[PDB]
Protein backbone atom coordinates (compact mmCIF):
# COMPACT_ATOMS: atom_id res chain seq x y z
CA UNK A 1 0.00 0.00 0.00
CA UNK A 2 2.45 2.68 1.20
CA UNK A 3 5.67 3.45 -0.71
CA UNK A 4 9.14 2.26 0.31
CA UNK A 5 10.18 5.83 1.04
CA UNK A 6 7.13 5.97 3.30
CA UNK A 7 8.05 2.92 5.33
CA UNK A 8 11.68 3.98 5.51
CA UNK A 9 10.93 7.54 6.51
CA UNK A 10 8.56 6.11 9.14
CA UNK A 11 11.52 4.28 10.75
CA UNK A 12 13.70 7.36 10.75
CA UNK A 13 10.84 9.35 12.23
CA UNK A 14 9.96 6.76 14.87
CA UNK A 15 12.75 4.33 15.92
CA UNK A 16 15.64 5.79 17.92
CA UNK A 17 17.14 5.51 21.41
CA UNK A 18 16.09 7.24 24.66
CA UNK A 19 17.81 10.43 25.72
CA UNK A 20 18.11 11.41 22.06
CA UNK A 21 16.66 12.25 18.65
CA UNK A 22 15.95 10.41 15.37
CA UNK A 23 18.93 8.73 13.73
CA UNK A 24 20.42 10.57 10.76
CA UNK A 25 20.76 8.89 7.34
CA UNK A 26 24.50 9.15 8.01
CA UNK A 27 24.83 7.15 11.25
CA UNK A 28 23.12 4.63 9.06
CA UNK A 29 25.70 4.84 6.31
CA UNK A 30 28.41 4.67 8.96
CA UNK A 31 26.67 1.86 10.87
CA UNK A 32 26.54 -0.27 7.74
CA UNK A 33 30.15 0.64 6.98
CA UNK A 34 31.22 -0.76 10.37
CA UNK A 35 29.92 -4.16 9.24
CA UNK A 36 31.34 -4.14 5.75
CA UNK A 37 28.26 -3.12 3.80
CA UNK A 38 28.92 -0.17 1.53
CA UNK A 39 25.95 2.20 0.91
CA UNK A 40 26.15 5.65 -0.71
CA UNK A 41 24.73 8.80 0.95
CA UNK A 42 23.36 9.96 -2.45
CA UNK A 43 21.67 6.56 -2.82
CA UNK A 44 20.19 6.48 0.65
CA UNK A 45 18.74 9.91 -0.10
CA UNK A 46 17.06 9.22 -3.46
CA UNK A 47 15.71 6.17 -1.63
CA UNK A 48 14.05 8.31 1.02
CA UNK A 49 12.74 10.96 -1.40
CA UNK A 50 11.09 8.41 -3.61
CA UNK A 51 13.27 8.98 -6.66
CA UNK A 52 14.85 5.53 -6.26
CA UNK A 53 12.19 2.94 -5.79
CA UNK A 54 12.47 -0.84 -6.12
CA UNK A 55 15.74 -1.56 -4.19
CA UNK A 56 17.16 -5.09 -3.91
CA UNK A 57 16.37 -7.43 -1.05
CA UNK A 58 19.84 -6.93 0.40
CA UNK A 59 19.53 -3.17 0.80
CA UNK A 60 16.18 -3.66 2.51
CA UNK A 61 17.55 -6.26 4.87
CA UNK A 62 20.43 -3.84 5.56
CA UNK A 63 18.21 -0.98 6.75
CA UNK A 64 15.60 -3.20 8.44
CA UNK A 65 18.68 -4.35 10.35
CA UNK A 66 20.06 -0.98 11.45
CA UNK A 67 16.62 -0.42 12.95
CA UNK A 68 16.59 -3.97 14.38
CA UNK A 69 13.22 -4.72 12.74
CA UNK A 70 12.41 -7.67 10.45
CA UNK A 71 12.83 -7.00 6.73
CA UNK A 72 9.26 -8.26 6.32
CA UNK A 73 8.35 -4.79 7.52
CA UNK A 74 9.13 -3.84 3.91
CA UNK A 75 7.35 -6.53 1.92
CA UNK A 76 4.36 -7.93 3.78
CA UNK A 77 1.66 -5.39 4.51
CA UNK A 78 0.30 -7.70 7.15
CA UNK A 79 3.39 -7.38 9.36
CA UNK A 80 3.86 -3.85 8.13
CA UNK A 81 0.50 -3.49 9.83
CA UNK A 82 1.31 -5.45 12.98
CA UNK A 83 4.44 -3.37 13.50
CA UNK A 84 3.06 0.08 12.65
CA UNK A 85 0.72 0.04 15.63
CA UNK A 86 3.76 -0.69 17.80
CA UNK A 87 5.60 1.99 15.85
CA UNK A 88 2.80 4.38 16.60
CA UNK A 89 2.96 3.29 20.21
CA UNK A 90 6.54 4.54 20.47
CA UNK A 91 5.52 8.06 19.51
CA UNK A 92 2.84 8.27 22.20
CA UNK A 93 5.15 7.23 25.03
CA UNK A 94 7.56 10.18 24.84
CA UNK A 95 4.68 12.63 24.20
CA UNK A 96 4.56 15.12 27.07
CA UNK A 97 0.82 15.67 27.44
CA UNK A 98 0.46 11.90 27.52
CA UNK A 99 3.22 11.41 30.08
CA UNK A 100 1.60 14.03 32.32
CA UNK A 101 -1.85 12.47 32.02
CA UNK A 102 -0.89 8.87 32.80
CA UNK A 103 1.34 10.28 35.53
CA UNK A 104 -1.50 12.17 37.22
CA UNK A 105 -4.05 9.38 36.66
CA UNK A 106 -2.05 6.41 37.98
CA UNK A 107 -3.29 5.66 41.48
CA UNK A 108 -6.84 6.61 40.65
CA UNK A 109 -9.25 3.65 41.09
CA UNK A 110 -10.72 1.79 38.10
CA UNK A 111 -13.93 3.86 38.15
CA UNK A 112 -12.33 7.29 38.14
CA UNK A 113 -9.78 6.27 35.52
CA UNK A 114 -12.41 4.96 33.12
CA UNK A 115 -14.15 8.27 33.89
CA UNK A 116 -10.94 9.82 32.63
CA UNK A 117 -11.21 7.93 29.34
CA UNK A 118 -14.85 8.97 28.83
CA UNK A 119 -13.60 12.57 28.96
CA UNK A 120 -10.79 12.16 26.44
CA UNK A 121 -13.44 10.80 24.11
CA UNK A 122 -15.64 13.83 24.80
CA UNK A 123 -12.68 15.97 23.81
CA UNK A 124 -12.00 13.97 20.64
CA UNK A 125 -15.60 14.64 19.66
CA UNK A 126 -15.23 18.37 20.44
CA UNK A 127 -12.15 18.86 18.24
CA UNK A 128 -13.30 16.86 15.20
CA UNK A 129 -10.83 14.04 15.72
CA UNK A 130 -13.78 11.66 15.82
CA UNK B 1 24.55 2.10 41.95
CA UNK B 2 26.49 -0.82 40.33
CA UNK B 3 27.66 -1.57 36.72
CA UNK B 4 25.87 -4.89 36.80
CA UNK B 5 22.56 -3.22 37.85
CA UNK B 6 22.92 -0.44 35.31
CA UNK B 7 23.89 -2.75 32.47
CA UNK B 8 20.91 -5.04 33.05
CA UNK B 9 18.56 -2.03 33.28
CA UNK B 10 19.48 -1.34 29.66
CA UNK B 11 18.90 -4.92 28.48
CA UNK B 12 15.51 -4.82 30.12
CA UNK B 13 14.47 -1.28 29.16
CA UNK B 14 16.15 -0.68 25.73
CA UNK B 15 14.89 -2.99 22.91
CA UNK B 16 13.27 -2.73 19.40
CA UNK B 17 9.47 -2.54 18.69
CA UNK B 18 7.12 -5.54 18.79
CA UNK B 19 9.94 -7.56 20.30
CA UNK B 20 11.56 -8.36 23.70
CA UNK B 21 14.77 -7.52 25.60
CA UNK B 22 17.94 -8.61 23.81
CA UNK B 23 20.08 -11.60 24.78
CA UNK B 24 23.82 -11.66 25.61
CA UNK B 25 24.45 -13.82 22.55
CA UNK B 26 22.88 -11.09 20.49
CA UNK B 27 25.00 -8.18 21.76
CA UNK B 28 27.87 -10.59 21.20
CA UNK B 29 26.96 -11.33 17.62
CA UNK B 30 26.19 -7.66 17.05
CA UNK B 31 29.71 -6.75 18.22
CA UNK B 32 31.32 -9.49 16.11
CA UNK B 33 29.55 -8.10 13.05
CA UNK B 34 31.21 -4.75 13.66
CA UNK B 35 34.57 -6.46 13.99
CA UNK B 36 34.41 -6.09 17.74
CA UNK B 37 35.28 -9.03 19.88
CA UNK B 38 34.17 -9.60 23.43
CA UNK B 39 33.84 -12.84 25.32
CA UNK B 40 30.33 -14.15 26.01
CA UNK B 41 31.54 -15.74 29.27
CA UNK B 42 32.90 -12.30 30.08
CA UNK B 43 29.62 -10.55 29.29
CA UNK B 44 27.73 -13.01 31.48
CA UNK B 45 30.02 -12.41 34.46
CA UNK B 46 29.53 -8.66 33.85
CA UNK B 47 25.76 -9.00 34.35
CA UNK B 48 26.10 -11.30 37.33
CA UNK B 49 28.55 -9.25 39.44
CA UNK B 50 31.36 -11.75 38.99
CA UNK B 51 33.42 -9.05 37.40
CA UNK B 52 33.25 -5.36 38.04
CA UNK B 53 35.27 -2.47 36.64
CA UNK B 54 35.05 -3.01 32.87
CA UNK B 55 37.46 -1.23 30.54
CA UNK B 56 36.33 1.88 28.73
CA UNK B 57 37.02 -0.07 25.57
CA UNK B 58 34.23 -2.37 26.85
CA UNK B 59 31.86 0.26 28.18
CA UNK B 60 32.46 1.68 24.70
CA UNK B 61 31.38 -1.50 22.90
CA UNK B 62 28.27 -1.86 25.08
CA UNK B 63 27.23 1.82 25.15
CA UNK B 64 27.68 1.94 21.35
CA UNK B 65 25.41 -1.08 21.04
CA UNK B 66 22.64 0.29 23.26
CA UNK B 67 23.18 3.53 21.30
CA UNK B 68 23.49 5.55 24.46
CA UNK B 69 26.47 7.35 25.90
CA UNK B 70 29.13 5.48 27.80
CA UNK B 71 28.48 8.24 30.39
CA UNK B 72 25.61 6.07 31.57
CA UNK B 73 27.82 3.78 33.63
CA UNK B 74 30.08 6.57 34.83
CA UNK B 75 28.24 9.86 35.58
CA UNK B 76 25.55 9.80 38.31
CA UNK B 77 23.82 12.83 36.78
CA UNK B 78 23.53 11.79 33.11
CA UNK B 79 22.61 8.44 34.62
CA UNK B 80 19.65 9.94 36.48
CA UNK B 81 19.01 12.11 33.45
CA UNK B 82 18.94 9.15 31.14
CA UNK B 83 17.36 6.82 33.67
CA UNK B 84 14.31 9.09 33.84
CA UNK B 85 13.88 8.18 30.16
CA UNK B 86 13.82 4.44 30.79
CA UNK B 87 11.38 4.75 33.68
CA UNK B 88 8.96 6.46 31.28
CA UNK B 89 9.16 3.47 28.98
CA UNK B 90 8.30 1.52 32.17
CA UNK B 91 5.42 3.49 33.64
CA UNK B 92 4.10 2.98 30.10
CA UNK B 93 3.75 -0.77 30.21
CA UNK B 94 1.83 -0.25 33.44
CA UNK B 95 -1.47 -1.76 32.39
CA UNK B 96 -4.42 0.55 31.88
CA UNK B 97 -1.87 3.26 31.25
CA UNK B 98 -1.80 2.20 27.59
CA UNK B 99 -5.60 2.39 27.26
CA UNK B 100 -5.61 6.00 28.40
CA UNK B 101 -2.36 7.00 26.71
CA UNK B 102 -3.11 5.87 23.18
CA UNK B 103 -6.21 8.03 23.04
CA UNK B 104 -5.07 11.26 24.69
CA UNK B 105 -2.58 11.28 21.82
CA UNK B 106 -4.50 13.08 19.04
CA UNK B 107 -5.74 15.88 21.35
CA UNK B 108 -4.65 19.55 21.01
CA UNK B 109 -2.86 20.90 24.10
CA UNK B 110 -5.78 23.08 25.16
CA UNK B 111 -7.73 19.81 24.98
CA UNK B 112 -5.14 17.79 26.87
CA UNK B 113 -5.39 20.52 29.49
CA UNK B 114 -9.15 19.91 29.72
CA UNK B 115 -8.16 16.34 30.71
CA UNK B 116 -5.54 17.08 33.38
CA UNK B 117 -8.24 19.41 34.64
CA UNK B 118 -10.69 16.51 34.93
CA UNK B 119 -8.21 14.19 36.65
CA UNK B 120 -7.69 16.67 39.42
CA UNK B 121 -11.52 16.83 39.49
CA UNK B 122 -11.56 13.10 40.26
CA UNK B 123 -9.28 13.46 43.29
Angstrom CA distances, B71 to A71, B63, B74, B78, B84, stand at: 32, 8, 5, 7, 15
Q: What are the backbone angles phi and psi of residue B19, rounded to the nearest 5°?
A: -150, 180
Q: Which of residues 65-84 of A touch B (CB under 8 A)?
A: 67-69, 82-83
Declared resolution, Å: 2.5
> How far does A86 lie from chain B, in Å, by closest CA?
6
Q: Which residues of chain B are within 8 Å of residue A121 when distances are taken between CB atoms?
A: 103
Please list the residues that pair with A108 across neighbouring strands.
A106
CA distance A116 to B101: 11
User: Taking CA atoms, what residue in B is nearest to A121?
Assistant: B103
Residue A99 near residue B88 (C-beta atoms within 8 A): yes
Nearest CA among A36, A39, A80, A81 for reference residue A56: A39
Q: How many CB pairs under 8 A join A and B?
A: 127
Nearest CA among A9, A11, A4, A13 for reference residue A52: A4
Q: SS3 sequence, chain A? A: CCCHHHHHHHHHHHCCCCCCCCCCHHHHHHHHHCCCCCCCHHHHHHHHHCCCCCCCHHHHHHHHHHCCCCHHHCCCHHHHHHHHHHHHHHHHCCCHHHHHHHHHHECECHHHHHHHHHHHHHHHHHCCCC
Q: What are the backbone angles phi and psi of residue A95, rounded to the nearest 5°?
A: -105, 120
Angstrom CA distances, B39 to B11, B31, B42, B65, B80, stand at: 17, 10, 5, 15, 29
Strand, helix or coil for residue B110:
helix
Q: Which residues of chain B are within 8 Å of residue A102 when distances are taken between CB atoms?
A: 91-92, 94, 97, 100-101
Residue A100 near residue B117 (C-beta atoms within 8 A): no
Nearest CA among A66, A49, A44, A71 for reference residue A3: A49
| Start-to-end C-alpha separation, chain B | 36
Q: What are the backbone angles phi and psi of residue B68, rounded to the nearest 5°?
A: -120, 175
User: After which residues does chain B break, using C–N > 2.5 Å?
Assistant: none
CB neighbour burial string for B45-78, b if at least 16 within 10 angstroms, e if fewer: ebeeeeeeebeeebbebbbbbbbbbbbbbeeeeb
Residue A101 near residue B98 (C-beta atoms within 8 A): no
Angstrom CA distances, B105 to A96, B8, B98, stand at: 10, 31, 11
Which one-letter DSSP state was computed for residue B75? -
Experimental method: X-ray
Sequence-ordered list of residues with C-beta below 8 angstroms from that of A43, at least 6 positions apart, any chain: A52
Nearest CA among B111, B107, B78 for reference residue A19: B78
| Start-to-end C-alpha separation, chain A | 24
Please list the residues that pair with A106 across neighbouring strands.
A108
Nearest CA among A7, A6, A128 for reference residue A67: A7
Sequence-ordered list of residues with C-beta below 8 angstroms from that of A57, at least 6 positions apart, any chain: A71
Instruction: Look at phi and psi of residue A54 and say left if phi exceeds 0, alpha if psi is from -120 to 50, else beta.
Output: left
Structural domains of chain B, with CATH:
1-123 (1.10.260.40)
Amino acid sequence: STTFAARLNRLFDTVYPPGRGPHTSAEVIAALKAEGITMSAPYLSQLRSGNRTNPSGATMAALANFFRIKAAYFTDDEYYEKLDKELQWLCTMRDDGVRRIAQRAHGLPSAAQQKVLDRIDELRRAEGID
